[PDB]
């Protein structure tokens, strides 16, 4: 048996920050507690009955199947309801004519809000084009501290465009609030900066915490050598954009340098940013990653339906 | 324990004319005794390892879910098949290759001909273009019973494009069929009346019960004082379309005429024909319809898969 | 309770040919077993908990949904997977993370190698343009040997194109290797000949086995009256199609000089090459055909997984 995170119970999840560290810690143990459960072959039935409704606007198979596979691994059953218009309120009214949890992707914030407008059973947040993605931030989470046995401490670098990526933005804010971090590397080509409204939303919690905040353009050995993780993520489409490449490639080369007791992480899906040569590292962790991502959903889930 | 509508057993549903009163009488009380399970939390796995596969070359996404959902609280299997070519009949034989049962949703009547010609499982007909709809004819009966306690003895006006509103003729003859009526507005824009061959057709049972039937062009505060139920639906695109949508509008200011005792039912989608601002009044039954369209189809899926 | 086929356990199921004849006949039995098991009413619940994803880039219904039947009759659950890139052994990576079994459908060879480079969990082939298609074969063998009561033995036209049909190339391969066939007849229009490389193939078995090997441009009644199975195949689009149908067709006339033991089958779909006027004929196997690859399909799914 589990004991569900009763902070959670019937209650939408549409940010990471509506959680105290100690609903972190405990949505950690509880999906490590799943995670042993499952993988020594033991099933999970207490969702029996119960119905999750997915309503994704914009596609992510991987975000998609994970909150499907966690359902159906906990007992609970999936219905599909394909995007067809009428409101968006009058679907989700459709939608909880017959479901007990839903999970809403959509690219803009006022969906979550309209949606909440109106929803009477749970709706999950599977990320938005605020930077708002819950469960991302949350398995990330879990991954460190799985992977190294705390986040408090890390060094860790966010690399990639660090001015648009406002999922990222949500990472740093969540961790900055929430742990005892040593020192942020923001690794970011020339112009794509983290913006200067998310280093002043964190200067609170950074200056309480005695958090190093560093910006550099690019990965140096020094850098590499200092960080327990390197979280890249994609560069989608500047004059410089191919040339700034290799300055934040993660390869095999780039590893040289890197302690032996680190991770590399991303939230996926990569390019050419994160070279295929280091997929067989031990500090490769971007694979189980996902899987961590199953269990913190899984967790959270359990947390939502049980009663 | 739950006792199936046994006229039902290994039928098909093709049209709710099939249905006498007292099955419909036993369908409905089936529907509720499942409602007060379901919400209660128990559970039902009566349909373990039995398949349904919907086969729908229309998208319909509030029927689909409604069936897929029935078919899992009941404790069944779903399984998907995307219209992809090779005849009806060929894919009906396909399913019924490893399926229990069926549901088809076509716009010709001719696609249901054809697949109960050949199919060996019950096929359940999620509505066509001929009007045939019999889980919506049937979900509309058990709103209206469980909403106002009887059918029998109402007034209820139908709303829209009577003409071409093929499956509000359906119900119509359905209702003048099996329930004592007192009175039956139809309100309808010039030239979109309840075509005359529908009147000649429930003229029988009309004359029978004494039910009045009165044709009007728009509601007015006579009308809506005297119903038990008003019934919209949607005006799809005459010279007067946009100037005769005022009245038929049904709002707050509609309501204020209405009596204490009624509701208001749409099968949906609506555009601007009902009001958001009566979407929190007690008597607006079409979001609470659409569940009781989940209840009615597991009492027809338990009643036709109980063996 | 059911015996596994214990060398499937935890392996990939890439092609026919890595299966004994003991294995084939193991696959049978319990494949005729779980037919008995399910048709009697009764349920199997040993997949509880285990997940597969199929990950489909060609439309085939027919062969998706089967497998997905299959898993759900073992009480397995399915998550769809929606192909969207990134590359393929990323995908895969991103399915392996929550699933048990994956089922792989690429026109490409290439796919599958790429596929099981990464894979870390079972891959079963659901047909490539290489000609791969396991679960077909074996539901065929399955189908005759159900039908008939034995494979060896038997007379089997193979009629279509056989130089393009690669999936009939290895049904070739397969009965030949296996099975003490009496004679296989090889109808097709001219040019569309059986290639030279794949008699090449064969020749060691068909000597040590003394199988006959018969070359013919169309059925007549001779070699109809000869055959225990006619297996047709679709010809898709030479100056003569339109005209060479006439000669590959089977309908009722075509029957008139067929055995009374005997069966036609057919991979489907079918166009005109396979009358409908032979379709309550009792030797008309193709539609059992299917529901044989539901329990095949089954029997495999149940041996790799079950631990």
Redesign the interface.
């Known amino acids: 048996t589990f004991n569900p995170v009763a902070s959670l119970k019937g209650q939408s999840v549409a940010s990471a920050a509506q959680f105290s560290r100690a609903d972190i810690d405990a949505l950690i143990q509880l999906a490590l507690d799943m995670k042993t459960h499952?993988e020594a072959?033991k099933?999970?039935d207490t969702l029996?009955?119960r119905?999750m409704?997915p309503l994704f606007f914009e596609?992510s198979?991987?975000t998609?199947?994970?909150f499907?596979?966690?359902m159906?691994?906990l007992?609970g059953?999936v219905?599909?309801?394909?995007?067809?218009?009428?409101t968006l309120?009058?679907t989700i009214?459709?939608?909880?004519?017959?479901?007990d949890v839903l999970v809403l992707r959509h690219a803009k914030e006022e969906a979550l809000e309209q949606a909440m407008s109106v929803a009477t059973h749970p709706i999950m947040n599977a990320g938005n084009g605020a930077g708002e993605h819950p469960t991302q931030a949350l398995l990330d989470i879990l991954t460190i501290h799985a992977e190294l046995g705390a986040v408090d401490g890390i060094a860790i670098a966010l690399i990639g465009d660090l001015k648009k990526g406002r999922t990222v933005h949500s990472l740093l804010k969540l961790l900055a609030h929430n742990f005892a971090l040593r020192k942020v590397y923001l690794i970011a080509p020339a112009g794509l900066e983290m913006p200067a409204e998310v280093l002043e939303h964190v200067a609170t919690d950074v200056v309480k915490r005695g958090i190093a905040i560093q910006q550099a353009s690019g990965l140096t050995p020094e850098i590499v050598a200092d960080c327990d993780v390197l979280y890249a993520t994609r560069l989608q489409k500047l004059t410089a954009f191919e040339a700034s490449k290799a300055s934040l490639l993660i390869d095999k080369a780039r590893l040289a340098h890197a302690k032996a007791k680190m991770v590399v992480m991303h939230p996926?899906?990569?390019?050419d940013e994160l070279s295929?040569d280091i997929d067989d590292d031990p500090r490769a962790a971007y694979?189980?990653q996902?899987?961590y991502?199953?269990f913190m959903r899984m967790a959270i889930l359990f947390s939502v339906l049980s009663?």
């Open positions: 499952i072959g099933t999970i029996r009955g119905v409704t596609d198979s991987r998609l199947s994970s499907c596979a966690a159906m691994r007992g059953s219905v599909n309801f394909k995007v067809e218009g009428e309120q009058d009214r459709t939608l909880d004519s017959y479901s996926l899906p990569r390019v295929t694979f189980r996902m899987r991502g199953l009663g």
